[PDB]
Design a protein around this ligand. Structure first.
Ligand SMILES: Nc1ncnc2c1ncn2[C@@H]1O[C@H](COP(=O)(O)OP(=O)(O)CP(=O)(O)O)[C@@H](O)[C@H]1O
Ligand SMILES: Nc1ncnc2c1ncn2[C@@H]1O[C@H](COP(=O)(O)OP(=O)(O)CP(=O)(O)O)[C@@H](O)[C@H]1O
Ligand SMILES: [Cl-]
Ligand SMILES: [Cl-]
Ligand SMILES: [Cl-]
Ligand SMILES: [Cl-]
Ligand SMILES: [Cl-]
Ligand SMILES: [Cl-]
Ligand SMILES: [Cl-]
Ligand code: NA
Ligand code: NA
Ligand code: NA
Ligand code: NA
Ligand code: NA
Ligand code: NA
Lengths: 327, 327
């Protein structure tokens, strides 16, 4: 067994539960993108640990969060590598499910360094089998993973949507603070199904695009983002945060006047996974007892630091690396 | 340890040694090839076990060969998966090397079923570090892997060329029968380095293109294949076999009059890895004491069965599938 084991006495039960995606990133660096029919060699290759779910759990885990990952991987070596990597990043793996019928989810990523361009084929694989019915069957209808002591749920939109919406509803009904990062951007049919579950979303935390698609409010800047915030309170979301890249974020705690905090000024070398860093860091700081604005201010600093280095999860800070006054 | 362990006496020492490549094949099925900058999902995914070295060892292992794979893979789960798969296909893994500094070799393969076009990026990864110096350091200057019992070495051209050439020379100097399948096709500077090593090759087994590049004879058919055989005997190769796809193969055993045997008449579904199947089968049948012609007739039948099914190693025959008199 690679995975963690629960106690009979609930003594390692987490503060934060992440129900979402784990994907291996197969990154081939190419002199050119291949044309139809082409066989070519990479110049280099890098194996990474991705999926927005795992990225968020690892951002929190790296700052010391009592965080557990709930997901589906293979019985393959990739799954075993992911389970150990989560543990080395401070994430509990007791509720990582494994199937012998599917490979671990992965992204096949080609990077042209010269052109900086990317081609990506997502192969969710085992992730496609991470259904509400399997989740229920393995957790006694959510009782094994939604203990009384559970403070936060984080979901994204990189597993089957019904698993995301049913988990958010069940966690909200038990008084868990539910965080939903609607990434990648929901398609029109996904928006129709999300909208009725927004009353169960304690914190909705999209980027500009994702806010635009859910609200119909075109978000390009602060003023429009404040409109999108009001629209999401109307759809029944208690707390709203919208990230704005280098422009930082806007938020509203329980319908109080919006706030803009701008981005940190930093030399951005590689922004990959910055948003996942922001979300996981934000929830970590709220679990330590920070209010939403104090949490998001520090999450903004953590994400700024991540964009100064390559590596997605490898660019997420540990507490010893942070400048004084972040932790 | 997933890998086999050699015994103090060497009671499980192999008849056939394969020194070559192990690549995982990561196959993403797509509705269209990705354009520069595109992120898409696959319609389907398949993980296969490839690399010409491993393909040739597994063709032999599936028929019951006492074969051992010498290669480099990662300490990653993909390396552990390959080592187990080799064992399940009757290949000894005691001299599989593992590096913590590189991933397991792999091919990232995109297949558009509709257009039936491919895009392939080959990531040799750990294979690029499988050097003569590393091999000598790990095997006491080849003593550990070239024991007196050893009858056959098979090499290809899918690992650093100096590793392939030095292994052939050392094996042939010990009275091992050396088999060299110069695939993939040698580049002009690789042809120049190979030619002085041909006197140390017992059996050169190219396809038409490879025979063309090595000899300067334009090989397109039986007649020109026969010319290429003479040119190879002049460069000091003892036994030559040239495979001709659907037109079967030509050979000469040690300067004797060359022989043409045509292709089996079969419904070709997927020819992928047929050549590897032919080469591995051929050497198994010679280890059973068939002469070159008898071994190649049986290999031709094995490769013909393989072209009737998809899946590369999954299409290689077991002994129950072979007509009477082949085994
Ligand atoms: N150039 C930059 N400078 C400072 N902070 C940045 C930044 N880019 C991103 N951030 C920080 O990261 C947070 C999320 O930004 P964004 O949503 O662009 O991430 P992302 O993960 O979508 C980038 P990518 O599209 O490459 O994956 C921002 O709210 C901000 O805190
Ligand atoms: N269409 C066909 N019909 C019958 N036998 C065939 C065949 N194609 C290949 N073979 C068998 O396989 C041997 C090697 O064929 P070839 O060298 O084309 O395989 P290959 O692995 O290079 C095909 P691919 O280019 O798809 O990887 C032949 O000598 C023959 O025994
Ligand atoms: Cl496990
Ligand atoms: Cl990583
Ligand atoms: Cl799969
Ligand atoms: Cl790190
Ligand atoms: Cl091992
Ligand atoms: Cl396979
Ligand atoms: Cl590598
Ligand atoms: Na920790
Ligand atoms: Na932790
Ligand atoms: Na980064
Ligand atoms: Na066997
Ligand atoms: Na065997
Ligand atoms: Na086949």
């Amino acid at each position: 067994r690679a995975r963690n084991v629960r106690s009979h006495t609930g003594e390692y039960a987490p503060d934060i539960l992440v129900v979402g995606s784990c994907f291996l990133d197969y990154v081939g660096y190419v002199d050119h993108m291949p044309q139809v029919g082409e066989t070519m060699h990479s110049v280099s290759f890098h194996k990474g640990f991705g999926g927005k779910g795992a990225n968020q759990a690892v951002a929190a885990g790296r700052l010391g969060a009592k965080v557990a990952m709930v997901s589906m991987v293979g019985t393959d070596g990739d799954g075993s590598d992911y389970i150990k990597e989560l543990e080395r990043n401070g994430v509990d793996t007791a509720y990582m499910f494994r199937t012998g019928k599917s490979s671990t989810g992965l992204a096949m990523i080609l990077v042209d360094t010269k052109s900086s361009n990317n081609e990506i084929v997502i192969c969710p694989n085992a992730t496609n089998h991470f259904t509400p019915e399997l989740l229920r069957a393995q957790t006694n209808n959510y009782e094994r993973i939604l203990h009384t002591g559970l403070k936060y749920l984080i979901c994204q939109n990189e597993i089957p949507l019904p698993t995301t919406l049913d988990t958010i509803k069940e966690a909200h009904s038990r008084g868990v603070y539910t965080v939903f990062n609607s990434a990648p951007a929901p398609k029109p049919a996904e928006v129709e199904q999300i909208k009725p579950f927004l009353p169960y979303v304690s914190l909705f935390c999209p980027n500009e695009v994702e806010a635009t698609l859910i609200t119909g409010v075109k978000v390009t800047d602060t003023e429009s983002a404040f409109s999108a915030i009001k629209a999401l309170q109307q759809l029944g979301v208690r707390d709203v945060v919208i990230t704005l890249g280098a422009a930082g974020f806007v938020l509203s705690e329980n319908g109080a006047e919006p706030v803009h905090v701008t981005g940190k000024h930093v030399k951005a070398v590689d922004t990959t996974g910055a948003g996942d860093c922001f979300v996981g860091s934000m929830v970590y700081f709220m679990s330590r007892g920070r209010n939403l604005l104090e949490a998001c201010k520090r999450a903004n600093e953590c994400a700024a630091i991540s964009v100064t280095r390559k590596g997605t999860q490898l660019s997420y800070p540990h507490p010893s690396e942070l400048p004084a006054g972040v932790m």
